[PDB]
Design a binder for these strands. Structure first.
Lengths: 51, 127, 150, 117
RNA sequence: ACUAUGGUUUUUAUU
């Protein structure tokens, strides 16, 4: 991340890969009638914003 | 047994015989270094020959005509591998490993229309 | 195993004592006329051993140890910005660049061409003196005045 | 000539500089170093390296006064604000606390939002 | 938020 986040922190939260913009989102609950999946846990893919 | 291989490259054509026996090489009924000694491709025919070790147990007899030396040497190298892959079919796996059983990616194509050699880019300065 | 490595490309010479040869005789070579660029093997260093000191076993080995590029400085993208950064000189280039970089005195020294030029530029390079060495330490400090992220 | 043993380190990171100063147990500055005093210019005085060697040169600026423990005060948003600590963690004395504060906090303080607006 | 770096889009014509 270099200069885009300084803080005291070099740690990262790992919730943001294969969870957003897809599955899902542009095709929300589109096929197969699943209701578990990473698309329900997408409410954990936050913060990130505000520090 | 007499193991035979043909080879051809850019208007040159060669024939190779491989036999078991005494470690000798003959070309156009001359010695390998009897008329060559300054030509820039004269060593490339040795590339497949060390793969089975040289001049100790194998007899080579080569004939060639047509074209120029870089053509003749490339034709002879592939004629040697086409004969050597008959002498032992397990060498096929080793000749692939060095590229010596394939026709190389340089061959003569027909003249592109007009424009001198028809490969260069003409004037396009903006002046 | 068939398609593995693939090995060779070039082979080591028992008499020259350097693997740079296949890129050293590529210098001042035009229209594929290699023998007019290969004219410095067993001739120019035989003359260096008759113009500066004695022997030639380490002269070309030590001249390129004294003139050694290690860093280069470029404007490079992070997107959309293009920060200046120092980058290390790539391992296959690191000792193969400096031997081609002694050109800004070649038409001025009057050294009587090719092998006699080489017999003078190496006696400066073997002390890190003369041509292009002020520019080498200028790049070394261009990378000292800014070290970026590492 | 004598050992102070206790003190405080004062760090600042700007978008155009990095500063490190060390004070004794009575608040007297024993030595100070800046990245501009380290030969750097412009925002390059804020590089993580220039911040690390400015701190290393400040540890060299207090090498004789005899230090065993101190606390750190970190100011400013500048990119030097992490690398400045690594040379101080190598100065040979203990860091008991680090108080971290940036000026004018508002609007979330500009973290990466990871595919959000 | 950082290739250090170029002023500003002529009077105005009328198949």
């Amino acid at each position: 991340i270099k200069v885009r986040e300084n803080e005291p922190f070099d740690v990262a939260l790992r919730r943001f890969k294969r969870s957003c913009e897809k599955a899902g989102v542009l095709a929300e609950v589109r096929r197969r009638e699943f209701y578990e999946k990473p698309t329900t846990e997408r409410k954990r893919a936050k913060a990130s914003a505000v520090k | 047994n007499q193991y035979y291989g043909t080879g051809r490259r850019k208007s040159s054509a060669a024939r190779v015989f491989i036999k078991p026996g005494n470690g000798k090489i003959v070309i156009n009924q001359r010695s390998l270094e009897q008329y060559f000694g300054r030509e820039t491709a004269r060593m490339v025919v040795r590339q497949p020959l060390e793969l089975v070790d040289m001049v100790e147990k194998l007899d080579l007899y080569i004939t060639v005509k047509g074209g120029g030396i870089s053509g003749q040497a490339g034709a002879i190298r592939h004629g040697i591998t086409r004969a050597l892959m008959e002498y032992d079919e397990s060498l096929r796996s080793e000749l692939r490993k060095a590229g010596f059983v394939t026709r190389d990616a340089r061959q003569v194509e027909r003249k592109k229309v007009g424009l001198r050699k028809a490969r260069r880019r003409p004037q396009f300065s903006k002046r | 195993r068939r398609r593995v490595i693939g090995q060779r490309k070039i082979l080591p010479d028992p008499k020259f004592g350097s693997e740079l040869l296949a890129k050293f005789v590529n210098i001042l070579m035009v229209d594929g006329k290699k023998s007019t660029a290969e004219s410095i093997v067993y001739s120019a260093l035989e003359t260096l051993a008759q113009r500066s000191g004695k022997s030639e076993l380490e002269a070309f080995e030590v001249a390129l140890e004294n003139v050694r590029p290690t860093v280069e400085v470029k404007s490079r993208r992070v997107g959309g910005s293009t920060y200046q950064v120092p980058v290390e000189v790539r391992p296959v280039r690191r000792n193969a660049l400096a031997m081609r970089w002694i050109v800004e005195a070649a038409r001025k020294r009057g050294d009587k061409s090719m092998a006699l030029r080489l017999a003078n530029e190496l006696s400066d390079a073997a002390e890190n003196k003369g041509t292009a060495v002020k520019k080498r330490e200028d790049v070394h400090r261009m990378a000292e005045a800014n070290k970026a992220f590492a | 000539r004598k050992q102070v043993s206790d003190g405080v380190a004062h760090i600042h990171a700007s978008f155009n500089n990095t500063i490190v100063t060390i004070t004794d147990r009575q608040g007297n500055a024993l030595g100070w170093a800046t990245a501009g005093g380290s030969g750097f210019r412009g925002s390059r005085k804020s590089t993580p390296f220039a911040a690390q060697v400015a701190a290393e040169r400040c540890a060299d600026a207090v090498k004789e006064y005899g230090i065993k423990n101190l606390e750190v005060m970190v100011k400013g948003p500048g990119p030097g604000r992490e690398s400045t600590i690594r040379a101080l963690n190598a100065a040979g004395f203990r860091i008991t606390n680090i108080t971290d504060v940036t000026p004018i906090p508002h609007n979330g303080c500009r973290p990466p939002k990871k595919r959000r607006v």
